Amino acid sequence: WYTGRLNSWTKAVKTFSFQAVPLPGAFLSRQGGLNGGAFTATLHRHFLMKCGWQVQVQCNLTQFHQGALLVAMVPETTLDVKPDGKAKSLQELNEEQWVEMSDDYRTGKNMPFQSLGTYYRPPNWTWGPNFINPYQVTVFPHQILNARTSTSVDINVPYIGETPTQSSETQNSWTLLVMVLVPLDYKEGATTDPEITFSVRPTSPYFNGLRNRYTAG
């Protein structure tokens, strides 16, 4: 059981804003101060993996709090990278504190791409296949987080993939995201800006291969 800390909810957060934890990729950066300690390194000495997942969330509001949060498991997402094609840094995470909605994400416009070069004219990018539909997020496995009854999160997604197994350093078919349904509000005096904590558990893994610790290209 690995546990991690996310950024704390504030009333300043707009609606449809979000943040996500792409498993198992977040482990490499120890996202949210998480260190599995065993699996994290075991992946390095292997190449192919096939395992499930099991997650959880927590956020303590109080009698005089109100708000709504959306949590769901969206597969095959690619929102954990900057438009150029580089993953964000810890400084960038601490700065943003949240992912705000934008037409770019709504349209899949600014997802990473290869520059054509000097041979071609500059095309006008208009759309992409990894758009984000804010309203229809509820279709995938999900739950609500209401300040009056938000207890915790629970989910268990079976394995998925274009092939029975994939490479660890590249595979990304499952991802956890949280969305702010109703902006947080409350009377002063009770718990202010409650923290959000996440837990992750793999299930029935099968590590494959053997070699020395993976070396950067």
Next chain:
Amino acid sequence: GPIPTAPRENSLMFLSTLPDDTVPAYGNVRTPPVNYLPGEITDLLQLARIPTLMAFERVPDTYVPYVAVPTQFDDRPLISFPITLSDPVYQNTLVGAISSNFANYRGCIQITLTFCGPMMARGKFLLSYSPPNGTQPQTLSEAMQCTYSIWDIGLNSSWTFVVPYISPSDYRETRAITNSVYSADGWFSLHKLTKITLPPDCPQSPCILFFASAGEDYTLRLPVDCNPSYVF
């Protein structure tokens, strides 16, 4: 014997929806079994059944999937709309999107509501449906004559609602080029029955959400080609 050639009336033609097959090109192929993938899909009804969240333009470009109960009181309904899939309110729901790719539909429409507010507050709500007439009803008195139901705040938090399928035909127009009897089916509205309770030191302006889904008898027909506008 020799080919008793019987010439065909209109051969040497290309047809878009010809059902029969054609000549194989590179037969004798083998494929990797795909039984390991779960979550198989059979028909679009599987996705059409799962509910989703509608939205409305912000009260005086940001649509909102929630509504908050106001402190002010009036006899008019707080939120209402026509039951017509072409309306913007359904313009992003899964049911609306799927229906947009068909000539006509058939079956009931299912609606769900959810509350999000304080602890020690209570109230009452009235749900109603009104078939088409000269103009949309305005007063709760006029609405009361139509079909309605009572939803208590405190009994439960989601008093599911379904609009019965009523029409003088077997189907109805998915899109309405011109207003017609078979296209529009009146409106649906919600009315605040009584003033809600404001307990000590609790926040104000509770929040309510609405969800839509296709009924068990929902069915489409006559597929068509899509509008490619969304690319722009």
Next chain:
Amino acid sequence: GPIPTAPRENSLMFLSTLPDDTVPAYGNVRTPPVNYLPGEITDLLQLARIPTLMAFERVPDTYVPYVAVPTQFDDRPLISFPITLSDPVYQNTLVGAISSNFANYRGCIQITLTFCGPMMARGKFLLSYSPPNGTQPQTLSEAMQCTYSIWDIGLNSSWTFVVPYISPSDYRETRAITNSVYSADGWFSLHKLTKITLPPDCPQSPCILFFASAGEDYTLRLPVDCNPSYVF
């Protein structure tokens, strides 16, 4: 009745791989029996199974099908290469040639080695395989972590080796236009375990040879047309 002519959609066409036959031209022919010829062939696997000798460019235009064990010692492997049929080392083997005429392959690869040296000399050797990673392993220490085996000089003279079939798919690309996971599968290497014995008055620089062959489960797919470059 008359020909109920049903015109065909795309007749009056010529297709390369049409399976059906055509009209006979000069039928009623007899042929000399050929049962007296032995050595019939059924499938290319028969030739693919028979081993052959690889080669390497002479150490600083003469490729060499043998390698001689040096007197000097280093932790790096003495000879290693990627397991990719497009590499020059396989560019003349029967298995490589046959594979060059197909889209993809499937199965294990079998390797054999042979020694040719003095009488009263002994030694030890280590065989290893390394899946792909950031870069090819260099030190015997790093290699040891990967899969490996022990081959003694004196126990036998050919410690057969087979690379297991490992890949995240059902097949792999026979040729690699661009480096990809499904195309390359790491490398294979041999390491000198300990200094060999030099007996009295025997010659020096023993000789070692390597042979490759397709495994019992080796299989190709999706035939293609050849490159005619060899004519030049």
Next chain:
Amino acid sequence: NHTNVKFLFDRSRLLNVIKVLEKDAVFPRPFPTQEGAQQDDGYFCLLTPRPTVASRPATRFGLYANPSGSGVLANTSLDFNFYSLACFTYFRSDLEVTVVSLEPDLEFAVGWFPSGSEYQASSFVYDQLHVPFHFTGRTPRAFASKGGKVSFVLPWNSVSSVLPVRWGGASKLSSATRGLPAHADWGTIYAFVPRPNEKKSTAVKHVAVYIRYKNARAWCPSMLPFRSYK
């Protein structure tokens, strides 16, 4: 029964328009590409619903809404109908191809190869007549009379188990762009005239392409594209 995926995905739709070959020609080269190359464009097309640019796989879709400029323009395509139709993380089916001329009273043939291969270049010379080698090969070549019509069905030909509608991994350890698949296609198609290169003509010819899916299946439902409130 109209809602059935099979009953829905069994009709022909246009894909792209391409010119007619008249010589061996050079194949396009990967990106980024520098100027001065002899690679020519608008002759080869890949069979794939996903967006593509200059006959190669792509991630972001573009359009030349601005006509003026300098440099070389590029081709693009995307199955509007398929994408708007429904939601499915995974998909597999046999791809059926059909071609019809777009010029008055033309005759030609078509050539194809599956994934993983590449165009065969170079040409022979017969009795002082030069002919590209792509005329003959291991793979099918089709022939039709004047006017023209071509039809046949290709079997599944990619290593991957299925076709991912919205993928998010990477293909290679170094420099691989995230989310860009590898072999989500049925190969490449091209057209040519059975005449020697010595008799090339200046007038250009153009031809359209239509495809159809047979025996479709899907998994893991997904979302649908957004539409504005403007």
Next chain:
Amino acid sequence: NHTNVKFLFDRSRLLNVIKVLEKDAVFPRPFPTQEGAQQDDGYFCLLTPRPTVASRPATRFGLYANPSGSGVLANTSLDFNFYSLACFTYFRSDLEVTVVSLEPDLEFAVGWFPSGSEYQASSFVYDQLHVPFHFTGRTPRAFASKGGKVSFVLPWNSVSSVLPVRWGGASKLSSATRGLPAHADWGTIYAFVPRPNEKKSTAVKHVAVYIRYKNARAWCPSMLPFRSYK
């Protein structure tokens, strides 16, 4: 099952391109041949995968990489695909022939004879119109409408039990060249126009040839061609 020789050797491939006959013409004569003869070239072709020169069997393959010079050029051919495909000392199968025009809207017929025979020369004169005798004979003659397409299957027609891929004997006691086979072919093919010689036209016509093997078998595996390390 793709590895099966039968499943492999059952597809059509181009063989050669030839002109269209317009007269009786003289057949090529054996080597060495002196100048001044009326024998014409580029009209008759022999059906054989092995190398040939000037419509006759050969041992060494050549190519005219140097265009300039003086004298008469020659035709050559070799089944690149077949030779690269596999190894078999011996082979036998029925040979299927197909022909398609290489000119705009042309009509013609084709003529064939098996091994051991030779072209029939001379011509008759009808009502002051001269016609070669090769129009009529004991062997098949095929006719097609404009545009053109010809197809049929020829049975095995050589005395030898099989076809030797790499032979090393000799055919005759005196002057016979070692390794040159005798009748490893299915005969000769030729094309002509059903018009009188009196109406000959200057413009030349050209036509391609495609062949296909049916029911192939092999024996005694062998080696494969070498490829350079350059």
